[PDB]
Amino acid sequence: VEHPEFLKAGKEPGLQIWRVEKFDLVPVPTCLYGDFFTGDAYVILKTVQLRNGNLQYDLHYWLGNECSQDESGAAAIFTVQLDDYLNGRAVQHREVQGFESATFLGYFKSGLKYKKGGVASGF
Amino acid sequence: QALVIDNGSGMCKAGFAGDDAPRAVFPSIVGRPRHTGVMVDSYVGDEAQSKRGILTLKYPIEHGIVTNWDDMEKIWHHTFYNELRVAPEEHPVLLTEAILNPKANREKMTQIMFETFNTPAMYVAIQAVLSLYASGRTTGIVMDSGDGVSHTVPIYEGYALPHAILRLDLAGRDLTDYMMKILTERGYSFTTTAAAAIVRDIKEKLAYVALDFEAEMQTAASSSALEKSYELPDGQVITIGNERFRCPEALFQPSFLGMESAGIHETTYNSIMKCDVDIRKDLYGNVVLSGGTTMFPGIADRMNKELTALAPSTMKIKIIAPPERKYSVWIGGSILASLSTFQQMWISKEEYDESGPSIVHRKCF
Numbered sequence: 001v002e003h004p005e006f007l008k009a010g011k012e013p014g015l016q017i018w019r020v021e022k023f024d025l026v027p028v029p030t031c032l033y034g035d036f037f038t039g040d041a042y043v044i045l046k047t048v049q050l051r052n053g054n055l056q057y058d059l060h061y062w063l064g065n066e067c068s069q070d071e072s073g074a075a076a077i078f079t080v081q082l083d084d085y086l087n088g089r090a091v092q093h094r095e096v097q098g099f100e101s102a103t104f105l106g107y108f109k110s111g112l113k114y115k116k117g118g119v120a121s122g123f
Numbered sequence: 124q125a126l127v128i129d130n131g132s133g134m135c136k137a138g139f140a141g142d143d144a145p146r147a148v149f150p151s152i153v154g155r156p157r158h159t160g161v162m163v164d165s166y167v168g169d170e171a172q173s174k175r176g177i178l179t180l181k182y183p184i185e186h187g188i189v190t191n192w193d194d195m196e197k198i199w200h201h202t203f204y205n206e207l208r209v210a211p212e213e214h215p216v217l218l219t220e221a222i223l224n225p226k227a228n229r230e231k232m233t234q235i236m237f238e239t240f241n242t243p244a245m246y247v248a249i250q251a252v253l254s255l256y257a258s259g260r261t262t263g264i265v266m267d268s269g270d271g272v273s274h275t276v277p278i279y280e281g282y283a284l285p286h287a288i289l290r291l292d293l294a295g296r297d298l299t300d301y302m303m304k305i306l307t308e309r310g311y312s313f314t315t316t317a318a319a320a321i322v323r324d325i326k327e328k329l330a331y332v333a334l335d336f337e338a339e340m341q342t343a344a345s346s347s348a349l350e351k352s353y354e355l356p357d358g359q360v361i362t363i364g365n366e367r368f369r370c371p372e373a374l375f376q377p378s379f380l381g382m383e384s385a386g387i388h389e390t391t392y393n394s395i396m397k398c399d400v401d402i403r404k405d406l407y408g409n410v411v412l413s414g415g416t417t418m419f420p421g422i423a424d425r426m427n428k429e430l431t432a433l434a435p436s437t438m439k440i441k442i443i444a445p446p447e448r449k450y451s452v453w454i455g456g457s458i459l460a461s462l463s464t465f466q467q468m469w470i471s472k473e474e475y476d477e478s479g480p481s482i483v484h485r486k487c488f
């Protein structure tokens with residue numbers, strides 16, 4: 001995958017977030033990290049550096065209550081593709097609005113927020 | 124503009140990547156003259172079935188596997204030209220395959236698309252994995268039940284676990300046969316050419332899976348409250364009673380069909396149990412049902428109940444059975460073939476000319 005966003009992924013410790021927008025993976029502006037459209041699906045990559053300083057990858061796809069099937073489906077498939085791209089080293093996690101893992105909720109230092117709406121289905 | 128084709132044993136589903144449903148669904152049937160040369164070649168789909176009186180009818184896909192390549196080409200030709208109405212040389216084509224599709228078959232399918240159809244690009248995807256994706260998951264167990272065979276396919280992080288796949292040799296065709304039989308014994312007689320179609324429709328319109336089978340058998344013996352009327356093509360109305368839920372019961376009790384095999388609940392359990400202990404919680408929590416033969420009302424509640432009984436009392440069990448789950452495979456393909464990363468997934472004509480059909484084992488898995 002020559003997907004320009006894949007080239008940018010998992011370089012240094014931290015957090016990257018993309019939104020599924022009409023069958024593509026579009027980066028979220030860093031200033032909007034943590035405000036999730038409940039009508040959308042998102043791909044989140046958490047790069048941690050251990051004490052020996054080896055890279056560690058957790059890959060979360062987050063499904064809004066009102067995301068359409070193409071959006072949730074694309075987020076699943078993009079997750080797999082990104083994982084293959086990262087040589088199988090990312091642990092994959094399905095995160096559903098209202099039921100996120102504590103780990104995922106931990107990523108967001110002022111608490112994640114939900115908001116209605118978003119980008120329309122690509123179907 | 125990519126095309127998606129899901130070649131079922133019974134029904135072929137075809138359409139345009141980006142659509143949320145197949146544009147064409149037709150019987151996977153090729154019809155040829157019995158007596159060559161005496162009356163004014165071949166027919167596919169509903170037409171084969173209409174003219175079946177004067178045709179030898181063949182089904183090129185058995186258990187998901189192609190058993191006849193000349194007939195398969197007729198199906199695809201009819202798909203491109205009569206159903207979708209496209210020039211196939213202008214469209215990347217995504218095709219589906221069964222679990223354990225033989226190596227030679229995947230090669231032949233690739234060769235046909237490039238050499239006979241001149242497709243510019245193609246990709247082969249596994250059906251169960253497409254159903255999982257359509258449900259917005261990368262890990263889960265797919266119970267796929269269509270025409271001739273049901274399969275339980277554990278999938279972890281985007282890929283099937285081949286060692287844990289099991290199969291029950293009972294699906295929709297068996298359930299139609301069995302609805303005929305039990306309705307015949309009730310006193311009815313299905314004698315016309317449209318016998319199979321009538322009983323099939325009774326099955327699709329009125330069968331349901333009972334949560335508690337003996338409670339339901341009792342309810343039906345002592346009351347008329349479960350009974351339904353069904354109008355035949357000729358206008359005669361017949362009554363359907365316990366056949367409604369006894370018919371799909373055979374999925375859970377294959378002995379009804381004189382079979383040794385374990386039911387679908389147990390096949391599913393057994394598949395989960397063939398998998399690394401660490402992932403089983405994620406299989407039980409994501410049991411995805413797909414195919415026509417999973418369309419019975421009640422089937423998800425019944426699966427939940429049966430798996431609850433088999434799994435440790437603290438297992439979270441979740442059954443995922445959305446209303447469109449008949450075309451889940453197709454819809455997963457529509458999504459996949461629409462992705463911006465799919466142009467880099469497919470075998471191009473250029474790659475095929477360079478590598479020939481064996482490219483399929485390196486590009487598609």
Ligand SMILES: Nc1ncnc2c1ncn2[C@@H]1O[C@H](COP(=O)(O)OP(=O)(O)OP(=O)(O)O)[C@@H](O)[C@H]1O
Nearest residue numbers: 131132133134269270271295296327414415416418
């Ligand atoms: N609403 C329904 N209730 C029960 N059964 C149904 C319903 N709709 C369709 N079926 C049955 O589904 C069966 C075929 O479904 P499906 O199209 O999923 O199989 P297929 O894709 O052709 O087969 P396979 O995947 O096995 O090669 C038929 O036996 C049909 O009667």
Ligand SMILES: [Ca+2]
Nearest residue numbers: 039040118119
């Ligand atoms: Ca949306």
Ligand SMILES: [Ca+2]
Nearest residue numbers: 088089090091
């Ligand atoms: Ca991984």
Ligand SMILES: [Mg+2]
Nearest residue numbers: 131132269414
């Ligand atoms: Mg099928």
